[PDB]
Design a protein around this motif. Structure first.
Motif, mmCIF file in Angstrom:
data_model
loop_
_atom_site.group_PDB
_atom_site.id
_atom_site.type_symbol
_atom_site.label_atom_id
_atom_site.label_comp_id
_atom_site.label_asym_id
_atom_site.label_seq_id
_atom_site.Cartn_x
_atom_site.Cartn_y
_atom_site.Cartn_z
ATOM 1 N N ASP A 121 0.846 -1.186 0.000
ATOM 2 C CA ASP A 121 0.000 0.000 0.000
ATOM 3 C C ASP A 121 0.887 1.244 0.000
ATOM 4 O O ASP A 121 2.071 1.196 0.349
ATOM 5 C CB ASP A 121 -0.931 -0.047 1.210
ATOM 6 C CG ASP A 121 -1.864 1.140 1.285
ATOM 7 O OD1 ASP A 121 -2.564 1.421 0.290
ATOM 8 O OD2 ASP A 121 -1.910 1.778 2.355
ATOM 9 N N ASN A 123 -0.590 4.913 0.734
ATOM 10 C CA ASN A 123 -1.024 5.890 1.730
ATOM 11 C C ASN A 123 -1.135 5.230 3.099
ATOM 12 O O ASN A 123 -1.861 4.244 3.266
ATOM 13 C CB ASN A 123 -2.359 6.506 1.313
ATOM 14 C CG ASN A 123 -2.270 7.247 -0.009
ATOM 15 O OD1 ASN A 123 -1.445 8.145 -0.180
ATOM 16 N ND2 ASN A 123 -3.114 6.862 -0.957
ATOM 17 N N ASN A 227 -1.577 -0.687 6.223
ATOM 18 C CA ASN A 227 -1.711 0.101 7.441
ATOM 19 C C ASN A 227 -3.115 0.065 8.027
ATOM 20 O O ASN A 227 -3.357 0.738 9.034
ATOM 21 C CB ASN A 227 -1.304 1.562 7.181
ATOM 22 C CG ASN A 227 -2.285 2.291 6.284
ATOM 23 O OD1 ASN A 227 -2.380 2.011 5.090
ATOM 24 N ND2 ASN A 227 -3.015 3.241 6.855
HETATM 25 MG MG LIG Z 1 -3.356 2.929 3.516
#
Ligand SMILES: [Mg+2]
Length: 280
Positions: A121, A123, A227
């Protein structure tokens, strides 16, 4: 509107056929045939067409002799590209009698059926936090060195963005600009969640799409970095073992989900040969 091409992935099957992910390309200008050149070499007997909204497709007959609008070319078309393993340059040229020739450039990657991928990922995973921008987003410390060493051990980094398609070229520029203690982000394709590519659970559908361009008898997606807990779910349902999923928070603490262990990009890098063993 967006003008460019989403990084394309092509996989050589063990019967030497070729499969690829969908081609997402847009000519922002054109408001028409489309030719292709791969590695500065024009590809003969291959063309694309364009819908009124600007999205392009390969025309392909079905069994009722009607033209279908495919985003995924046939294996025979892909063999004409003469792709090399790894990165390839690709350009699309849209010729219009009113607006002349328009050109966009992009990237197309060729992997083998036994190639192992490592998802990341962007962001919250590369950047520290998950419309006005300058590319100065903060980056988690030590991530460029870690990913560099994963790539050096034979794995292929594949990046995942859920931002709108308007930010796609920006995200490419942000990743290629990162420099941390001399280390850079290894070159690799940036996949875009299909919800951002409107035309006519999303991260999970995208990763299952990627997994399905590889034969069923191999597990191509080795590990993943994210995240949010939804990143872990997307990876699990695309074939990543829980032991190889890493979820980072805003304090840069990385949880290795399988071992329920707290760590970081620096500590994971120190254990690179254990967690990302070198491939033959
Ligand atoms: Mg993310």
């Amino acid at each position: 509107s967006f003008s460019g091409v989403v990084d394309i992935i092509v996989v050589r099957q063990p019967d030497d056929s070729l499969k690829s992910m969908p081609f997402h390309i847009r000519f922002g200008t054109l408001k028409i045939n489309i030719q292709i050149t791969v590695n500065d070499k024009k590809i003969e007997d291959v063309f694309m067409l364009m819908l009124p909204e600007g999205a392009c497709y390969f025309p392909e007959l079905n069994a009722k002799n009607e033209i279908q609008k495919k985003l995924r070319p046939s294996s025979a078309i892909l063999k004409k590209f003469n792709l090399k393993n790894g990165y390839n340059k690709i350009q699309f040229i849209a010729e219009s009698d009113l607006q002349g020739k328009q050109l966009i450039e992009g990237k197309i990657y060729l992997y083998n059926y036994d190639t192992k991928l490592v998802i990341s990922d962007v962001n919250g995973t590369v950047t520290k936090s998950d419309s006005t921008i300058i590319g100065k987003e903060w980056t988690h410390d030590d991530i460029a060195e870690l990913y560099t060493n994963i790539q050096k051990n034979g794995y292929k980094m594949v990046y995942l963005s859920s931002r709108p398609l308007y930010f796609y070229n920006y995200t490419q520029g942000y990743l290629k600009g990162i420099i941390q203690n001399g280390f850079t982000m290894p070159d690799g394709p940036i996949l875009l969640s299909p919800d951002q590519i409107i035309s006519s659970e999303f991260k999970g559908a995208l990763l299952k799409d990627l997994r399905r361009v590889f034969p069923e008898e191999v597990n191509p997606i080795f590990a993943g970095f994210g995240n949010r807990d939804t990143d872990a779910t997307a990876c699990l349902y695309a074939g990543v073992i829980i032991d190889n999923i890493f979820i980072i928070n805003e304090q840069s603490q990385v949880e290795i989900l399988g071992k329920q262990e707290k760590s970081s990009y620096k500590k994971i890098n120190e254990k690179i040969q254990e967690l990302f063993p070198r491939l033959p």
